[PDB]
Amino acid sequence: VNTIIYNVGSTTISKYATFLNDLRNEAKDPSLKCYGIPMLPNTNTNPKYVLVELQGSNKKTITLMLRRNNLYVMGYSDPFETNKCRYHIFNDISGTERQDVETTLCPNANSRVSKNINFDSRYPTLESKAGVKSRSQVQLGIQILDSNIGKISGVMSFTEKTEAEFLLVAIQMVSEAARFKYIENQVKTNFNRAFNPNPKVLNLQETWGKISTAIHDAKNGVLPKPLELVDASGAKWIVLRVDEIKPDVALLNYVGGSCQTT
Numbered sequence: 001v002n003t004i005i006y007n008v009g010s011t012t013i014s015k016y017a018t019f020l021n022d023l024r025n026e027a028k029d030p031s032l033k034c035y036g037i038p039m040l041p042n043t044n045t046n047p048k049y050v051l052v053e054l055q056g057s058n059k060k061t062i063t064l065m066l067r068r069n070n071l072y073v074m075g076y077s078d079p080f081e082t083n084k085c086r087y088h089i090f091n092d093i094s095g096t097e098r099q100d101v102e103t104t105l106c107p108n109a110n111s112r113v114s115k116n117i118n119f120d121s122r123y124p125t126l127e128s129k130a131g132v133k134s135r136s137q138v139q140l141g142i143q144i145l146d147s148n149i150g151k152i153s154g155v156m157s158f159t160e161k162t163e164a165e166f167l168l169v170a171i172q173m174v175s176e177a178a179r180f181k182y183i184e185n186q187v188k189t190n191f192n193r194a195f196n197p198n199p200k201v202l203n204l205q206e207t208w209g210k211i212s213t214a215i216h217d218a219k220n221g222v223l224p225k226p227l228e229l230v231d232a233s234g235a236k237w238i239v240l241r242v243d244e245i246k247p248d249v250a251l252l253n254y255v256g257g258s259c260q261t262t
């Protein structure tokens, strides 16, 4: 498994771009692509994971473990106490995958410790733990991510709110930013400040699977049926072609079957 290292304590937008660029290049299937957009790989493809080491300020680091097939965060780890590696697996991880999060995050079986994420990765759960009806109320931003890392990295006890807040922010600035060019650009336009995720960034996150299927199944560039998304103002946004949603998409969820590759 490879790890993409990103210095959150000291960056520029070009470094952010390079980061996502490296995570996409690593996550994507070396050949799967529909309409010129890279597609994630089939679950049987190896490696099945990719790590993202987030280096905050004050020597506070957190490593994220992502599944390559759908870019989902399965858990995270942080340097703890002396030679310890504290892994936190999402509660929606099951079977062998739970051993995979533990061993892939903390290879040294001798010094690794467990600290379970007692809830799933679904936004409504994360939002509920963060104590917000919508993640739109939790601003995203570099300095913010850095600050959330510091509240967890090495700290024995943090609340589910503190934890959910870190997750919400990290999930969107990492995997959601990698999945969508639009989301990356939003972060870069507000690189030096805190910003609330707009209706389009959130909708994109919620309709990624549909968009990916729709584009995979697209005929000549025509979406099987009209896809109803929402723009930045929160207005209805009906897409009929791949050219209309493609600019905002960097990676497509793995969708089984052949497709118009270009």
Ligand SMILES: Nc1nc(O)c2nc(CNc3ccc(C(=O)O)cc3)cnc2[nH+]1
Pocket: 071, 072, 073, 074, 090, 121, 122, 123, 124, 171, 172, 175, 176, 202, 205, 206, 207
């Ligand atoms: N990076 C990452 N990691 C995960 O573990 C993860 N899990 C999910 C499932 N849950 C959800 C819940 C709500 C919505 C939504 O409200 O749009 C979309 C997906 C989605 N997106 C995810 N992204």
